C-alpha cells in the first residue's frame, strides 16, 4: 500500500490526501502510522485525517511511515489474522531464494470491524502482533495446530480449500510477492556485501532467514 | 564526483546537449537533496538510491517518447555496449 | 498617527540608515542619545523618561556591520533588540540568504516588526532599505517582503535600493542576484526607488566638485532624498502629499512602479554665492540628463508621471510658472494619454545641513520623481550580462548547492523580459 | 552528625589511608599535632564526621588501622601525620599471612578479627548517628584481600542498616608483582558483591597511565598514585561536610547508581588533572572539566568505556559555578554520545554541587560511572584463574591452610554469574 | 485576621522560602532582626516588645540547609522552634520520606502548626513550597498534606511545586517520585502552581540577559509571583481578590486546579530605558507563548480560564481595553462555555526590587494565573519517562525495601492516566 515518510513527506501526504478527497468526497481512507525504529507494535496507531497526526511533542523527531491501512482483510472466525513466513536467502550471486511450505498464522484477540473513529484506539482488533495480543484476556494458548490464536499456515490453507478456494494460486502469489520483495531489496545488499567483504579478500559466505509478514 | 565524471566519460553519455557543467550541477543537487533527506545531515557522498535517481534522469533525457520500462533498460544496454568496447 | 517603519537590511542598508537617522535626529532636534534639549511622531516613539526610540529595525546576516552601530556615536538611540544580527555572512549568494542562513533569522525580525506595529495607530507603510547585487539584500529582502504581505496586506511597501552601474561593479555574481530579486521587487512592492553608485559619483564630481568621493557622501544624498519624500508627514506646508496620494499620482498601471529620483539644488559652498538658485533654475536642473541618479538618458523615452516635492520658500505661483515653461520645450516629451502629468507638493521646512557635509545651505529645494520609460535601457544591459554569464553555466553550482533550482533562473529571466516588453509597449501613442 | 568510621587494611590500605588522612587534615585545617589552625568558620561545622573531640581542642580520627605484619604500623606511626592517630587503634599481628588468602581469612585473620571488632564497636558507639564505614584495601594479597572480606562479612551482619564502601585495588594483568594473586582476587570478588553497598575499582595501571600521559611525570611513585585515590575519596563525601546548592549524601548517590542490588562497581575520576607547565594554557570552566571527566583517558580503571555503555553517571562538582551551565553540559554529553548510554534510563547523569573547592583549586569534579565495560576486568581475571586451576598450581598452600577444592569452583561460578549479569544489560 | 501560614519542605522549599521572606521583609519594612525601625498581620505576628515573628515553619530531613539559615543574615528572625531539621535525608527516596523517616518527624511539625494556627483569628489557608521529584519534598509533603487535610478540612491549601523539566534533570529517580507524588496534589491540595527550571532558564537568558544564572534568580522570580498572589490581602487598592475568590474563579471543576504562572515585565534594567510598559504591552507579553514559566505551549491547547493581577499605576479602563484586544485575536482561543473568561484584580502597591537582583524598578506589573489544557503535554512527557524504566523494573528495589508495596507504582500510573483523560475531555467542543 502507498506510503509516506514523515516528517520529510508530510506536505506531499497532505496534498495527496486533499486532492483525492476533492476528487472523491465519499472517500474515507484509514491510515496507519508506524515508527521506523519501533518494534512489537509499539508506537503504531491509526488515523483518519492528516491533521490527526500528533505533531506536538519531542517524539516527532523520529522518522515514521504512514501507510494505507488494509480495511478489508480476510476474516477467519471473525478474527483478522496475519501470516509470518520463513524465507531463506541462500546467496546474492547467484540469487537463491527458498520458501518454507508452512508458516505461523497469528490471529487477533477481538472480532474485526471496519475502521471507524469509535474503534481506532482498539489495538487488539487492529494489530496482529503476538507480543501485544498475548497480554489480551482473549488470547488462547492451544497445542493444536488448527486452534488458538497461533496456528499453522498449512492448516489455514486447508480450511480455505475446504470452502473451494484454489490454494495453489494462493501459494503461487505468495511466492511471487516474496521473490519480488527479495529482488527489490537485493541491490543494496550487494552494495553492502561489496563494502563489507571486498572482492579478492578472504571472507565467509552469508545466508539469512527472514520473517515475512 | 570523480566517480560520476569517470562514469560519464566511460559510457559516453556526455554530448553537446549535456556538458560537464550540467553533470556537476545535477550531481550537486541530487547529493544535497539525498543528504538532507536522511536524519543525519552529513551523508558525505552519494548513496545507491541517489544513483538510481541520477540514472532515471539520464534515461529520461535519452530515448524520448518511449515507455519507462523501455527507458532505463535502453540506457543500461548502451552503457554495457560502451563498457564492452572499453575493456575489449 | 502617521507612523512609518523603515527596515534597513544588509550592509548597504545599514550604512545608509546611519546617515538617514543622523539627518532625522538633526531635523527633529533629537540628540544622539535620545533626549530633546507632534512632528517627531512619524519616525520616533516617546517613552516616559522623555527618550525617543527610532521606529526601525536593523537586520544583517553578519555582525561586523552592526557592532559599529552598537559601539558608535548612535549607540544609546536604537533599541538593543532592534539591531538583529546573524552569525554567518550570506557570501554574495541569493540562495544563502533566501533558503539556508536567512531562514534561521526571519522569525526574530518578524516578531520585532509585529512589536513595532503594535505601537502604531496610524501606520502608513514600510521603508525598505536594501541593495541588489548582494546575498542578504537580495535573499532576505525577498523573504521579508513575501511574508510582510502575507501579514500586512494593504500597507504600502516603498523600496529604496542600489542598482548595478553600467560598467562599475563590485562582484562577479551581481547580475544573478539582481535578476533574482526582480520577482520580489515586482509583485511585492508599490514603488521601487532605484539609484546606482556611478551616477552619484558623477554628480559628486561635477556638482559638489569632489575629486575622490566615497560611500558616505552617497548615503547623505540618499538620506536627503528620503527626507524630502516624507517631509510632508512631519512638517506643515501649503500642498501636502501623503504617502498614498504619492503613489496614486505616480503609478499609472499596477506593474509600472519604478520611478526615478532627482535632487536639484546640489551645489558646493563656493559656487553657491554666485548662483541665484531660483525656483525656475532648480526646476530646470531636475530635467537634466546628467543629473539623474540612474545612468540613463531621459530623452530616450517617454514621461508618464511627475511629482515635484518643494521644501522651503516656494510660493505656488512660481511653481505654476516653472511647470508652464517646462511644457514649452520639445526636448522633454510626454505621453499623449497624460495631458496633466505634474503633481505638486509644497512644505515650509527648508533642508538642513549636517556638520562636516558637502552640501551648502539653501532656502529652497525640490525633489523630482519621474515615471519614465528610460529604465528599460538600464535593465537591458544587465539582462545581456546575465545571458552572457549563463550561456556557459557559471557559478550556478554555488546557487544549486544551497537549495535553488535552475527553474528560478529561467523564470526570473522570463519575468524581466515580460516587464521590459510591458515598459516598451506602454510608450506607444494612440 | 552523620559520621563515618574509617578502616585501613594491609600495606596498600595503610599507605592510601595515610595519604587520605593528610589530605583531609589539610582540607579541614588540622595541625599534625592534632590542633586546629585554620581560617574559616565552615571547616569546623561538620568536623564531627571524621574526627573526635578529645581534651583541650584536640581532634583524633577514627582510623582503625589493621595489618598482620607489624612493619606497616611502624611505618605509619613514624611518618608525616603519624602521631595524629589514637595509640590503641593499631591492631597488628605477628606475621604477614604470606601472600595467602586462606591464612588471612581462616587462621591468622580469625585470631585478630575479634580484636579489631572490639575497637570498631568502641568507636561506632561514640557516634551520634553513624552514616557508615569505608575500607581501603587491595584484592591481591592475603592480609588485605582476606581481612577486608572477613571484617566486612562480620561488620555487615552487625550493622545491616548502615552504609559500607570499599576503595579496592583490582589486580592488573600487565603490572603484576605477585604470582598467586589471581587466586586471591577470584576468592574475594564473590564476597565483595553481597557485603558492601559500594565498591570502587582502582586499577594501578590506569593510575600509571594518568601519571605518564596527563601529568607528564617521568618518575612516579606510590605517593603520586595514592594522591589520586585520596582526591576521589574526598570528592565522594564533600557534600556531607560542606554546604551546597544540591547536596548529595552517600545514600543519595547509592539510590541513583545501582539499578539492581549487585551492580555496585564504579569507575572514579578527577576533573582538573592537568600538568605543571600546561596550567597557564588552560581555562578552568565547566565544559572543559566535563570533557576531561568523560574521556577514556582520565579514568582510574583499566577498561575502555567505548567497549560498553554507561548505566548511570554521577558528577559531584565542587566550586562556585552555575546550575544552568552544568545542566546544559550534561544535556550535551547525552545528546552527543547517544550510543554510549543505556536507552531505558533517561538522563543517566546524577549531579551535585558543593561551594567549597579544594584548596588552591577554584573548581573540581568527581566522576563516578557505572558501566558494563567493567565486566572486562572480571573476565580478564577469570581466564588467568582458569589457566592456573585446571592444572592445580600453588594450591597446596590453600588446601593445607584449611580450605577445600569446592570453594574455588564456587568463587569462579559467582564471578562468571556477575560477568554474565553485567553483560545482560548491555 | 487575614493570616496565612507558610510551609517550606526540602532544599528547594527552604531556599525559595529564604528568597520569599527576604522579599516580604523588604516590602513591609522589617529589619532582619524582626524589629521595625496593619499590613503585616498576615505573614508576621507581633510580640510585646515590637518583634515580628514570621508565620512559617521550615522543615527538612537533613541539617545543612536549615543550619545555613540558623547562622546567617536572618538568624534572629525565626523562632528557633519553627526551624525544624532531622538527622538523615530521604536520599531521593519517596519511601523514606513517607514510610520510614517522615513518620518519625510528623509530630513536631503538626505541633508547631497547631501552635501557629491557634495564634490567628481568621486563617485564609496554608501555603506549601516543595519539589516534585526530590524525595523529602515528595514523600514528606504527601504525609504532611494527608494529615493537614484531616486536621484542617474545609481550609485552603495552596502549593507551589517545581515540576521536573522535560530535558534537563538533576536526578535519575525523578520520574518515580514525580509519579508517586501526584496523588496528594490531585486529591489533597486546593490549588497547585507548577514551574519548570528550564523555562526560567530560558526566560532569564532571553529577557534578563543573564548568561549563567544560578538558583537565586529562579527563587527570586518565584518570590515575585508569590508576592503578587498575596498582595490584595496585605495592601489595599482597587478591585481586590482574596484566596477564595480566585480559587472559585479559576477552578471550574474540583479535579482541574493546575494553573500556570506568568510575570510579564521581566526587564534587565537596560532595556527599561528603551521601551514603555503600558497595560496593553504587559498584558500581551503575558499571553506570548515564550514568556511562560513551564515548558508548555498554549497554541496546542485551549485557555480554560484566566486570572490577571495588576500592581502599580493601573486603571480599569486600560485593563478593559487590553482584555478586548486579547479577545479579538484568533491565535489565542478560549473554550466555548466561558463567555466571560477573565477575573481581574488591581492593587496599588508597586513591586519591590531587592538589592543585587536582576529586575528593574517598573511602575506597573501584571501576574497571570492561566488555566489551560496544554499542561497535559508536560505530564505526558514525564509519564513517558516513568514507564520507560518501570518496564525493566529498574531502581524499584530501593522503594520496595522501605515499606512500600509494588502496587503503588501501578496505582499512581493509572491515576495519572485518568487525570490526563479528564483534562483532555474538557477540551471538546459543545
Ligand atoms: C603549579 C600549580 O599550580 O600546582 C598546583 C596544581 O594546581 C596542579 C599541578 C596539582 C598538583 O598535583 C600534582 O602535582 C599531582 C601529582 C600526582 C598526582 C596527582 C596530583 C599539586 O600537587 C596539588 C595542589 O592541589 C591542592 O592543593 C588540592 O587542594 C589538593 N591537595 C592535596 O591533595 C594535598 C593534600 C595534602 C597535602 C598536600 C596536598 C586536593 C585535591 C582534592 C581534594 C583535596 C585536596 C596544587 C594546587 C598544586 C600542586 C602542589 C603541584 C594537580 O592536583 C590535583 C590532583 O588537583 C595535578 O593536576 C592538578 C592541577 C594542577 O596541575
Ligand atoms: N551607494 C552605496 N552602495 C553601497 C553601500 N554599501 C554597499 N554598497 C554597494 O552594494 C554592493 C555590495 O553589496 P553589499 O555588500 O552592500 C550587500 P549585503 O552586505 O547585504 O550582502 P552580503 O555580501 O551577502 O552580506 C556594491 O555595489 C557596493 O558598492 C553604501 O553605503 N552605499
Ligand atoms: N597503590 C599502591 N599499590 C600498592 C602498594 N603496596 C602494594 N601495592 C600493590 O598491591 C599489591 C600488593 O599489595 P600489599 O603488599 O599491600 C598486600 P598485603 O600486605 O595486604 O598482603 P600480605 O602479603 O598478605 O601482607 C601489588 O600489586 C602491589 O603493587 C601501595 O602502597 N600503593
Ligand atoms: N527552582 C529550584 N529548584 C530546585 C532548587 N533546589 C532544588 N531544586 C530542584 O529540586 C529537585 C531536586 O530535589 P530536591 O533538591 O528538592 C531534594 P529534597 O531536599 O526535597 O529531598 P532529599 O532527597 O531528602 O534531600 C530538582 O528538580 C532540582 O532542580 C532551587 O533552589 N530552585
Ligand atoms: Mg554583507
Ligand atoms: Mg603485607
Ligand atoms: Mg536535599
Author numbering:
A (entry chain E): 216 to 428
B (entry chain E): 570 to 657
C (entry chain C), E (entry chain A): 1 to 37, 47 to 439
D (entry chain B): 1 to 426
Authors' account:
Among these, polyglutamylation—a dominant and conserved modification targeting unstructured tubulin C-terminal tails—plays a pivotal role in defining the tubulin code. By combining cryo–electron microscopy (cryo-EM) and functional assays, this study uncovers an unanticipated type of tubulin glutamylation pattern, where TTLL11 extends the primary polypeptide chains of both α- and β-tubulin with specificity driven by the amino acid composition of the respective C-terminal residue.
To provide the structural basis for TTLL11 substrate recognition and interpret potential preferences for polymerized MTs and α- versus β-tubulin chains, we determined the cryo-EM structure of hTTLL11 (residues 128 to 657) in the complex with double-stabilized MTs (dsMTs) isolated from HEK293T cells. First, TTLL11 recognizes MTs in a unique bipartite pattern, where the MT-BHB and the catalytic domain engage adjacent protofilaments (PFs). The structured part of the MT-BHB forms a five-helix bundle (comprising helices α9 through α13) that is in apposition to the catalytic domain with a shared interface of ~1500 Å2. The cryo-EM structure revealed that the primary MT interaction motif of MT-BHB involves two amphipathic helices encompassing amino acids T571 to C580 (helix α10) and M589 to R601 (helix α11). Although the density representing the TTLL11 catalytic core (residues P128 to P486) is less resolved, it was still possible to reliably dock the AlphaFold TTLL11 model into the cryo-EM map. The following segment (K488 to V535) connecting the catalytic domain to the MT-BHB is not visible in the map and therefore not included in the model, nor are the intrinsically disordered N and C termini, which are also missing from the cryo-EM map. Together, the cryo-EM data indicate that while the MT-BHB is rigidly docked onto the MT surface, the TTLL11 catalytic core (together with intrinsically disordered regions) and tubulin C-terminal tails are inherently flexible and can adopt a wide range of conformations.
